[PDB]
Amino acid sequence: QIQLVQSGREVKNPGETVKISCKASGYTFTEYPMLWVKQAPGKGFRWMGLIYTNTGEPTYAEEFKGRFVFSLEISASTAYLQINNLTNEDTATYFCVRDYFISLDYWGQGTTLTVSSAKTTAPSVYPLAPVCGGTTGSSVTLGCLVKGYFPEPVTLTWNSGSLSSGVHTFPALLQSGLYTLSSSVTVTSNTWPSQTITCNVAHPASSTKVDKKIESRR
Amino acid sequence: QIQLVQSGREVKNPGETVKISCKASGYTFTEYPMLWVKQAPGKGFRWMGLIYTNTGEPTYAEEFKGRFVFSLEISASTAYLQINNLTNEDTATYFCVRDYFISLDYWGQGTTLTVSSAKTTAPSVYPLAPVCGGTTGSSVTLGCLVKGYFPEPVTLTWNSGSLSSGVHTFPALLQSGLYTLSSSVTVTSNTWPSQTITCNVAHPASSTKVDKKIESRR
Amino acid sequence: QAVVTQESALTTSPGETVTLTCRSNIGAVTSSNCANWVQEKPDHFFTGLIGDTNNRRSGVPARFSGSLIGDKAALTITGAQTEDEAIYFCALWYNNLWVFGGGTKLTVLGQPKSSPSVTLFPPSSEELETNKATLVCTITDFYPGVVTVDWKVDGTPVTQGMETTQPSKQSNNKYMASSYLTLTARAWERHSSYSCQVTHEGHTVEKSLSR
Amino acid sequence: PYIADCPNCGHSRCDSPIAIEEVRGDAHAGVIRIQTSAMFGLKTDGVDLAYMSFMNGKTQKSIKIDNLHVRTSAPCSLVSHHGYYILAQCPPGDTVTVGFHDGPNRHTCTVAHKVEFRPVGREKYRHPPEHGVELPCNRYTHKRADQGHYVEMHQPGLVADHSLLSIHSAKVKITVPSGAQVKYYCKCPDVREGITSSDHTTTCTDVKQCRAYLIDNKKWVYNSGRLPRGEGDTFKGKLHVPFVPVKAKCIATLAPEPLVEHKHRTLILHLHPDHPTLLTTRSLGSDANPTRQWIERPTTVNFTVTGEGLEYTWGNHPPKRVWAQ
Amino acid sequence: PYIADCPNCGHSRCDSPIAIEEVRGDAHAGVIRIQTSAMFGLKTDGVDLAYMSFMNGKTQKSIKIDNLHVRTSAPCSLVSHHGYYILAQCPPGDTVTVGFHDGPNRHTCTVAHKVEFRPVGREKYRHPPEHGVELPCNRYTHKRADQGHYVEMHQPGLVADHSLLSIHSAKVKITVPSGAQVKYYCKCPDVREGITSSDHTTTCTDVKQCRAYLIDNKKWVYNSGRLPRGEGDTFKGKLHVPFVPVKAKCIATLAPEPLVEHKHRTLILHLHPDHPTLLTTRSLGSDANPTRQWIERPTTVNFTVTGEGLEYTWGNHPPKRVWAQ
Numbered sequence A, B: 001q002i003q004l005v006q007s008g009r010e011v012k013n014p015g016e017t018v019k020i021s022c023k024a025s026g027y028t029f030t031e032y033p034m035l036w037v038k039q040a041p042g043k044g045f046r047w048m049g050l051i052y053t054n055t056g057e058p059t060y061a062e063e064f065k066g067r068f069v070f071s072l073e074i075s076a077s078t079a080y081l082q083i084n085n086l087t088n089e090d091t092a093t094y095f096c097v098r099d100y101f102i103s104l105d106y107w108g109q110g111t112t113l114t115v116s117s118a119k120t121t122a123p124s125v126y127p128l129a130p131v132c133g134g135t136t137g138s139s140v141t142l143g144c145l146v147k148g149y150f151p152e153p154v155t156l157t158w159n160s161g162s163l164s165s166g167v168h169t170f171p172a173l174l175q176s177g178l179y180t181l182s183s184s185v186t187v188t189s190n191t192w193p194s195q196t197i198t199c200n201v202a203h204p205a206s207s208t209k210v211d212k213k214i215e216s217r218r
Numbered sequence C: 001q002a003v004v005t006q007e008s009a010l011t012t013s014p015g016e017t018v019t020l021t022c023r024s025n026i027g028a029v030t031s032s033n034c035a036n037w038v039q040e041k042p043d044h045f046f047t048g049l050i051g052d053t054n055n056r057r058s059g060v061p062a063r064f065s066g067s068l069i070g071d072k073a074a075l076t077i078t079g080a081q082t083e084d085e086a087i088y089f090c091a092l093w094y095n096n097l098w099v100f101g102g103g104t105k106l107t108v109l110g111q112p113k114s115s116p117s118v119t120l121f122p123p124s125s126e127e128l129e130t131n132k133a134t135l136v137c138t139i140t141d142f143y144p145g146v147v148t149v150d151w152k153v154d155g156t157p158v159t160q161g162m163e164t165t166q167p168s169k170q171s172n173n174k175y176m177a178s179s180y181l182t183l184t185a186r187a188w189e190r191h192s193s194y195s196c197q198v199t200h201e202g203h204t205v206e207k208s209l210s211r
Numbered sequence D, E: 001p002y003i004a005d006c007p008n009c010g011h012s013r014c015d016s017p018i019a020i021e022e023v024r025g026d027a028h029a030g031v032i033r034i035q036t037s038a039m040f041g042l043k044t045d046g047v048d049l050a051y052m053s054f055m056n057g058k059t060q061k062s063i064k065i066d067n068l069h070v071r072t073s074a075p076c077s078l079v080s081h082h083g084y085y086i087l088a089q090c091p092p093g094d095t096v097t098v099g100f101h102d103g104p105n106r107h108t109c110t111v112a113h114k115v116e117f118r119p120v121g122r123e124k125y126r127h128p129p130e131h132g133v134e135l136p137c138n139r140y141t142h143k144r145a146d147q148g149h150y151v152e153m154h155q156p157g158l159v160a161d162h163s164l165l166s167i168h169s170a171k172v173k174i175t176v177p178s179g180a181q182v183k184y185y186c187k188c189p190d191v192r193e194g195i196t197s198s199d200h201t202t203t204c205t206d207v208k209q210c211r212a213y214l215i216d217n218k219k220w221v222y223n224s225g226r227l228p229r230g231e232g233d234t235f236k237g238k239l240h241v242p243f244v245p246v247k248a249k250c251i252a253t254l255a256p257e258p259l260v261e262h263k264h265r266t267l268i269l270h271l272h273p274d275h276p277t278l279l280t281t282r283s284l285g286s287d288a289n290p291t292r293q294w295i296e297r298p299t300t301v302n303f304t305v306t307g308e309g310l311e312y313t314w315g316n317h318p319p320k321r322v323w324a325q
Helices: C185-190
Strands: A003-006 A010-012 A018-025 A034-040 A044-051 A058-060 A068-073 A078-083 A092-100 A103-107 A111-115 A124-128 A139-149 A155-158 A167-175 A178-188 A198-203 A208-213 B003-006 B010-012 B018-025 B034-040 B044-051 B058-060 B068-073 B078-083 B092-100 B103-107 B111-115 B124-128 B139-149 B155-158 B167-175 B178-188 B198-203 B208-213 C004-006 C009-012 C017-024 C036-041 C045-051 C064-069 C072-078 C086-093 C098-100 C104-108 C117-121 C132-142 C148-153 C162-164 C175-184 C193-200 C203-210 D020-024 D031-036 D051-056 D059-064 D069-071 D077-082 D085-089 D093-099 D108-115 D134-136 D150-152 D238-240 D249-251 D259-263 D266-271 D277-281 D291-295 D299-304 D310-312 D320-322 E020-024 E031-036 E051-056 E059-064 E069-071 E077-082 E085-089 E093-099 E108-115 E134-136 E150-152 E238-240 E249-251 E259-263 E266-271 E277-281 E291-295 E299-304 E310-312 E320-322
Touching: A003 A092, A018 A092, A018 A111, A034 A068, A034 A078, A044 A068, A044 C086, A044 C098, A058 A068, A078 A092, A092 C045, A103 C036, A124 A198, A124 A208, A139 A155, A139 A198, A139 C117, A139 C132, A155 A178, A167 C132, A167 C175, A178 C132, A178 C175, B003 B092, B018 B092, B018 B111, B034 B068, B034 B078, B044 B068, B058 B068, B078 B092, B124 B198, B124 B208, B139 B155, B139 B198, B155 B178, C004 C086, C009 C017, C017 C086, C017 C104, C045 C064, C072 C086, C117 C193, C117 C203, C132 C148, C132 C185, C132 C193, C148 C162, C148 C175, C175 C185, C175 C193, D020 D093, D020 D108, D031 D093, D277 D310, D291 D299, E020 E093, E020 E108, E031 E093, E277 E310, E291 E299
Parallel strands: A010 A111, B010 B111, C009 C104
Antiparallel strands: A003 A018, A018 A078, A034 A044, A034 A092, A044 A058, A068 A078, A092 A103, A092 A111, A103 C045, A124 A139, A139 A178, A155 A198, A167 A178, A198 A208, B003 B018, B018 B078, B034 B044, B034 B092, B044 B058, B068 B078, B092 B103, B092 B111, B124 B139, B139 B178, B155 B198, B167 B178, B198 B208, C004 C017, C017 C072, C036 C045, C036 C086, C064 C072, C086 C098, C086 C104, C117 C132, C132 C175, C148 C193, C162 C175, C193 C203, D020 D031, D031 D085, D051 D059, D069 D093, D077 D085, D093 D108, D134 D249, D150 D238, D259 D266, D266 D299, D277 D291, D310 D320, E020 E031, E031 E085, E051 E059, E069 E093, E077 E085, E093 E108, E134 E249, E150 E238, E259 E266, E266 E299, E277 E291, E310 E320
C-alpha cells in the first residue's frame, strides 16, 4: 500500500550539493504532505520541516532554514531534499515521512550521506569459493569480496537479484582510505556448483559494473 | 538563625504564680506572633493560645482563659506565660512557638513546672572518682553525685562548661521527698588526673553553688 | 526550544505489560501536542505506531496503545512480544514544529540463542595476481549479538592486519559480522596455517584453511 | 489559535487567546456568530471538532472543550463551533462575555457589543416561542460545509516572548522555539536582524532593552485588528467562513387573535396582545389613510371602515379584510 | 467571621455567616463593595488571602475559597476580598445575591439593594466598553494596603448555642467551648450569672427554658445591625476599610461622532448614538439659551447658531465650537 522509497546513499566532498528523492506510493500525494527528518549518527531523530504537497510551501526547522531546500516533482509523486554547500557535519541519514493521523504514520527507508573528501577508486571484485578440499554438508556458503573503492555506495546482488534468500550483505567499512564490502550466500549443496551462482556489483561513482561467477577452486 | 530559648524549669507549691519567659532570636519579633503549647506528661500536645506580638492582643484557648495570662517584653523580644494560682495538675512542660507558614515552624526548648508542696533543701555534692586500684584503659570515667535537694531545678556543668563532650547528665529523680541527680564525664586517660576536672553545681532555690574538683582516691 | 525526554532503555519479558513515557520540558503533555510514537527496527526501518496521542496507525498490533498518564504521553505494550524489541521514539507538536525524544531502547525476552555460522575463505587467485591476499571470515546468524574473533596464522595469534566489523542486525533479528586479515601475496605464501576463531555465548568455533 | 488583547479580561485588558472580535448580533434567531482569536475545532492535527485548541505560551493546547461559556445578560447556548468561530444562541445583552474553563483557571474574555433579537414579524418579542407561524428570518447555519464567503487570513506578525531572553550568566540570552525565526537586537549595538538559533548578546545585559520576537509563520492567522502586521508580505491563506447568514424560516412569532366587534362602518376591536405588536391597515380607497401603532398595552381601538373595504394586520398573523357596507 | 441573619437565605431568613450588610452600588465602574459578616482572607492564623474562613457552629472554617459567587441580575465578577469585605464587578440589579459553595451545600445569602452603573459621562451606558476616553470616575481599589477610613469593630455580644444545653440524664446540662464564658440560668431559680466551665442545672429540666449563651470575646467583630450588643463595654478594635473609593479614571464612554451639516446660521445635525447621550449647548451670547436632551433614538436636530458662536457637546466627547456668521 504506502511505500516511500528513497534514493540510494551518497558520498560528496565538502562544499557540494545533493538532491535526495522520495518517491511516494499508495496514497494521493496531494492530501498528505512530507516531513523530512535527520537521524544523525549519534544524536537521534530531528524534524527538518514539512512541505505542503498541495500548495508547495515548505516550513523549515530553524536549524535547517538556509542550506536546506524542499521541492517536489508533484507530477511523479516525488518530494526532494536538497542540501547545498555541504558541510562535513551533515553526514547522517535523512528520512521522508508522511504526516497523517495527528503525527507521522509511515517513514521511508533513509538515504545516508557521507560528506568526505576523496578521489574515485573502482572496486576489485573477488570470488570467495570454499576450501580446496571436501566441504561436504547439507548446504554450502559462497562469498563475494568487494575491496578498495571510493566513494560510497556500491550495490550487490546475487544472480541478478533472483537469489535473495540466504544472503548476508555486510555493511561497507572504511580501511586505509578505501571502502570494503562483502557478502555471503548459502544454498543447498545440490545447487552449487551444479547451477551457476553469480555476484553482481555496481559502483555508480566510477561507472563500474562487475559480474563474477563463483568457480570451484579445482 | 531562629532560637527561642526559654527559662529554666520551676518548682512552685500550690497557689503560687509563675512567669515563664521566651526570648526570641533570628526574626523580627513583630511580624510573627507566639503560640504557647502545653505538653502534659501523659496527655500529648495542646494549643494554649496565641499572642499578636504586634498589637499585643492575646487569644486564649477556652481551657486556658482565666489563670493564664500572656504578655511580652516587646522591647527585648520576649513573650511570657504567667500562670496564677497554680493548681497541682498544671505540672507539665510549656513550649513557646512561632506561628508562620500557615502553621508553626519553630518550637522552643520547653520550661517544665513541677507544682509541689515542700520546703527548701540544699544539695550535697559528692565527687565520684574511680576505684582505689588500677583503672587502666584508653579513657576514664569520672562522676558527680548531687544528692538530696528540693525543689527543682539544679544546673550542672563540667569545668565551667568548657568540657561538654563526653558528658552524660542524668535527669533528677524524687526519692524520699528529695531530688537526686548525677552526671558522668569521660576523658582520655592522659587528661585526668593530670588536668583538673571540676563539677559545677547550682541550686537557685537555696542560693547554693558548689564547685567540686574530682580527686584521686589515693 | 522544547526538550522531549524518554527512558533510555527498558527490558521486559515476552508476555509482560510495559509502559514507555514521553516528557516535555515546557509543561504537561496535552492532546494539543498530538503525541506520536515511532518504532525503529534494525536496518533504518521506521514505522508509525500511534498519532494524535491515541490513534493507532493501521496494521499495528492492538497490544500497542497510547495515552496521557499524568503530565506525559505514554505508549503501553500489552503482552510485549520478542518482535517488539526495538527503539521507540516519541514526537510532540509545539504549535509550529516537531520535537523528537531521544528514543527508548526496549529489550524483550525471546529468540532462543543461536550459534554463529562461520566460514573462512582463502585469498582468491585473481587477487594473488595483485601481490595481495585477504582471508575473509564471515559470521552470520548469531544471537546474542556479541562475538570475539581471533585470528591465528601458523599457530600464532595475528594481532595486526585484521579488521572486524561491528555486529549488524539481520532481518530475522540475529546478527552478522565479518573479519578480514590482509597479508601480502608474499606473507601469504610464507606462513601455512590460517584460522579464524569465533567465540560466542561461551562456545568457540575455529575455521581453518590449509594452503 | 490566535492570541490578542481582550478588553476587560476579568480584571482588565489581558491578552486572551479567546479575544473576541466581530460580534454579530445582526440576525434574528437568538443567535450570534462570534470570532475568538482561538481556533477550536479539530486538534492541532486531525480529529474531533468538539476538542479545544487555544494558545498557551507560544504553544497551542489542543484538548477538550469541556466547559465553554459564551454569555451575555444571561448565559447563552452554544450552537456550533468551526475554526476561529462559534455560533451561540444568546438573549439580548448590552455586552458579550465569553469564556471556557481550562481546569486550573477560569480564563474568560469579555467585550462590549449592542445585542438585540427582534424576531421577524410585526410582533416585537424578546425571545422565540415554541409555536406560531414560520416566515423568512435571517439566521446562521449549524454547519461547516460552507463557502458562501471567505475572509482573508494571512500570516501572523511577530509576537513578544521574553521567556526567551534569559541570561548567559552576565549577558542576555535569547533562545528559539524549534528553530523558529527570532528577530533580535538590543538598544545597544549587537546582532541587528536575528534569524538564528539560540544566540547570546555581546553588548547589552538587561532583558528590558532587547527584541524578543517570534517570526513563526508556519501557520497563518485571522487578520484581527488586534494583530501586528507581518511586515514582509501579504501571504496566502484565503479562508472560508462557516456560519453564513442564511434564509432560514425561524419558528416565529404570532400574536393572540383579535376580538372583532361590529359597528356602523366601524370596527371596534378590543385587543390584547402578548408583546408589542405593530398593527396597521390600508383603507383601500385611492385615499389610503393607513395607520401604524405598536400595541403592547391591551387597547380597544377603532377604524373608520369605508364602503369598499379595509384590511387589518394583527402582527405577523395574516392580513384580514372586511366588507363594511 | 461574624454570623448574622440573612434575609432571604435561599428559602427564607436563615442565619448565614455571609450575611450581607452595607451594599454599595454607589461607584461607577461596574463595581460593588460588599461586607459579608464572614471574614474571608487569611486563615485563622497567618496565610493566603485567597482562603476562606466563615463560621460553622461556634467555630470558624478557614479553608479554600473554591467557588465563591456574588451575583445580581447576572453573575458578577469578583475583584478582590480583604477582611469581612469583598469587591466585585457587577451589572445593575434590583437585588444583590451572594454565595460560595462549601462543597456539601450551596449555602448562599441574598439581599435587596437598588444597583445601577452609570459611567461618568454624558453617555448613559449600561456597561463599560473596551475603548473611549478616560475621565475621572469614582471607583474602589483592588488593594488592601489601605487606611483612608476605618470602621468601629468592637466585640461581639453573646450568641445562642443550644447544642450546649444537653441533659445530665434528668437535668439540663450546659458545657463550654474551650473554657469560654457561658452566661446561664433558667426560668426556674438556679445559677443566675454563669461564668463557668461545664455546669449542670439543679432546678429546671427543659432545654427550652434556659440561657445558652457564649460570651466568647477573644476576637472582635464588625458592628453589624444584625449583631446583639456586647452589653459590657465599647471594647477597642478600630479597624480599617480596604476598599476606599478612589479617583480612578475609568476606561470610559464615548458616543459616535456627529454628522455636521451646514445651513444658514443653523446646524442641522443628523445624529445617531449608541446609548442615551445627554447633548447640550451654550449659545455664547450673554443670552445663554442652552439646551439639554438625552438622545438615545437617532434624531436629526437643529440649533439656531448666532453670530458670535455656539458650542456643542456630543456626550463626553469633547466640546465643539462653531463660527456661524
